[PDB]
Amino acid sequence: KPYTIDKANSSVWFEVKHFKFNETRGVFDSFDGKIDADPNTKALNVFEGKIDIKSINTRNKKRDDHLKTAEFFDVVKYPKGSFKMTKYEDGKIHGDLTLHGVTKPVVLEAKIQAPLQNPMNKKEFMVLQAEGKINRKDFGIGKTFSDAVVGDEVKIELKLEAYA
Amino acid sequence: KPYTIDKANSSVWFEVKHFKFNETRGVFDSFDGKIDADPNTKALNVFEGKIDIKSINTRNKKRDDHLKTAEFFDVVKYPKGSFKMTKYEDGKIHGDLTLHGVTKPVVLEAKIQAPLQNPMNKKEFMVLQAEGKINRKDFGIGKTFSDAVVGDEVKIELKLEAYA
Ligand SMILES: CCCCCCCC/C=C\CCCCCCCCCCCC(N)=O
Ligand SMILES: CCCCCCCC/C=C\CCCCCCCCCCCC(N)=O
Numbered sequence: 001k002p003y004t005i006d007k008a009n010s011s012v013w014f015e016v017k018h019f020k021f022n023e024t025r026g027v028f029d030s031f032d033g034k035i036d037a038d039p040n041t042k043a044l045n046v047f048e049g050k051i052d053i054k055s056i057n058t059r060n061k062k063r064d065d066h067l068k069t070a071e072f073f074d075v076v077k078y079p080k081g082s083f084k085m086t087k088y089e090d091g092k093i094h095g096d097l098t099l100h101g102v103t104k105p106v107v108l109e110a111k112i113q114a115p116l117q118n119p120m121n122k123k124e125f126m127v128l129q130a131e132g133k134i135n136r137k138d139f140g141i142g143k144t145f146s147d148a149v150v151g152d153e154v155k156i157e158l159k160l161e162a163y164a
Numbered sequence: 165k166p167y168t169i170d171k172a173n174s175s176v177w178f179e180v181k182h183f184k185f186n187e188t189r190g191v192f193d194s195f196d197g198k199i200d201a202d203p204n205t206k207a208l209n210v211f212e213g214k215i216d217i218k219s220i221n222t223r224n225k226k227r228d229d230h231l232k233t234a235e236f237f238d239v240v241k242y243p244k245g246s247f248k249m250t251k252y253e254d255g256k257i258h259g260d261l262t263l264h265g266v267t268k269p270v271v272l273e274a275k276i277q278a279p280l281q282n283p284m285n286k287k288e289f290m291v292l293q294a295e296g297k298i299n300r301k302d303f304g305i306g307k308t309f310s311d312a313v314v315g316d317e318v319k320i321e322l323k324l325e326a327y328a
Contacts, residue, residue: 008224009182011189018173021277021291022325025175029223059193059221060172113185119313127186148283161186 001045003035003126003162010160012051016136017151026064028081030055035162039114039126047085047093049158053078072142073100093130099139108132108156118163128160165200165209167290167326174324176215180300181315188227192245194219199326203279203290211249211257213322217242236306237264257294266303272296272320287327294322 012031018024033049053075058064068075078101086105087094093108114126135152136142142150176195182188197213217239222228232239242264249259250269257272278290299316300306306314 008226009186009188011223013189019280019282019289019291019325021280022173022293022323024173025177027223057223059175059191062172116183116185118183119310127183129186146283159186161183 001036001038001164003037003164005033005035006125006161006163010162011158012049013157013159015155015157017147017153018149020148020151024058026056026058028052028055029057033160035126035128035160037112037114037126037128039124039164042112042114044085044088044093044110044112044128047083047088047095049083051081053081071144077101097134099134100141102139104134104138106132106134108158124164126162126164128158128162130156130158132156165202165328167199167201167328169197169199170289170325170327171195174326175322176213177321177323179319179321180317181311182313184312184315188222190220190222192216192219193221197324199292199324201276201278201290201292203288203328206276206278208249208252208257208274208276208292211252211259212247214244214246217245235308241265261298263298263303264305268298268302270296270298270320272322282327289325289327292322292324292326294320294324296320 012028015023015025028051030052034046036046037044053073056064056067067073082098083095085093085095091110093110096103097106108130110130112128116125118125133153133155136154137152176192179187179189192215194216198210200210201208217237220231231237245263247259247261249257251258255274257274260267261270272294275293280289282289297317297319300318301316
């Protein structure tokens with residue numbers, strides 16, 4: 001305890017229904033975080049992070065540009081998203097998520113594997129993976145888009161490799 | 165039947181274990197395909213595709229550049245991968261997948277949502293989801309890389325919206 005996120009091997013994903021039945025996936029290419037944890041016992045002590053909203057991906061310029069617009073994220077007015085863990089208990093990461101200028105308490109379900117050793121450079125690391133779901137409309141993201149076109153519900157998955 | 169894949173809302177995903185405990189996900193940004201199907205009954209009649217191996221993504225240059233080397237895919241020698249369905253039965257796409265110059269039989273579990281109507285332009289479509297797994301080593305890709313560094317098992321997910 002503490003840990004630094006390896007960015008080449010770490011990821012922040014979302015998945016949202018498109019037209020009810022197809023799952024549209026994307027990432028934020030640019031994020032940062034703080035982690036402090038006991039690899040034995042697997043307790044998380046510190047867990048916060050930030051996403052840079054302009055780095056949203058999805059792999060389609062048209063869609064992604066439209067996502068940074070006032071119709072969805074409003075990147076100009078809100079360049080960042082943030083999450084601060086406020087409580088850890090047995091796999092539950094309770095925390096305040098802030099998106100589009102709104103903060104809501106949420107809970108991510110998490111899994112830690114640790115202590116691990118990078119078989120190349122011999123350095124100690126941990127994998128942290130977490131999953132939640134939120135309603136984009138609770139954060140006022142895309143009110144004008146119906147659930148039948150863009151799902152209200154958004155699955156969040158974090159996949160982190162972090163070096164002691 | 166026939167149908168024409170909407171490339172803007174379709175994707176080809178893979179997922180493989182990194183150092184056993186974390187998943188590396190990525191896509192082929194560029195692919196083509198043929199589909200013929202019955203909206204009712206949900207029978208698939210024709211299902212084939214090609215991917216351009218150079219479009220491999222993963223969002224990491226050092227990694228993606230390595231994947232394209234003779235160490236893995238050798239894109240300079242095998243520019244393409246391809247799949248053709250050989251038989252459709254009780255929700256399963258049986259077919260032949262060709263990667264790195266090797267063809268092997270693979271089974272994909274399919275899920276068809278059809279008939280669907282585009283809420284905006286009222287045009288008819290379907291969502292086709294297909295999932296399966298291969299051993300990358302069965303095709304000779306990355307023989308020198310241990311399963312504990314890069315998983316031998318690779319999960320394939322196809323997510324297509326296709327318009328009549
Ligand atoms: C890294 C440690 C702390 C984690 C920071 C968490 C930030 C939250 C990560 C994801 C948050 C969810 C953002 C909502 C994305 C959904 C965007 C709407 C996509 C619409 C798709 C479309 N069809 O146009
Ligand atoms: C209908 C289209 C036909 C194509 C269907 C095939 C879909 C994908 C097929 C194979 C995917 C194999 C991908 C395995 C890539 C290995 C990724 C290794 C990443 C980490 C490597 C490292 N050294 O860090």
